[PDB]
């Protein structure tokens, strides 16, 4: 905004985004799906839910 050899001035426009939490979860586990093997009319099959 101003520039002299002994004096300056500046302006900055900052925008912020604040997330507001509804709930926070701390003690968490990932799932892993191993399923089961089945043998049927000669064919080996992997089964999963």
């Amino acid at each position: 905004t101003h520039s002299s050899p002994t004096a300056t001035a500046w302006e900055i426009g900052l925008y912020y985004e604040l997330v507001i939490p509804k709930h926070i979860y701390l003690n968490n586990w990932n799932v892993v799906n191993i399923g089961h093997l089945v043998k049927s009319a000669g064919q080996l099959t992997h089964v999963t839910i």
Binding site: V31, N33, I34, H36, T48
Partner: peptide, 23 residues
């Protein structure tokens, strides 16, 4: 003279547990 190798018994313990629904 006669030299022979007699088998002798031994074991290792193996434990197993289930995984409900495979999860």
């Amino acid at each position: 003279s006669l030299r022979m190798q007699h088998p002798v018994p031994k074991y290792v313990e193996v434990n197993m547990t289930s995984i409900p629904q495979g999860v």
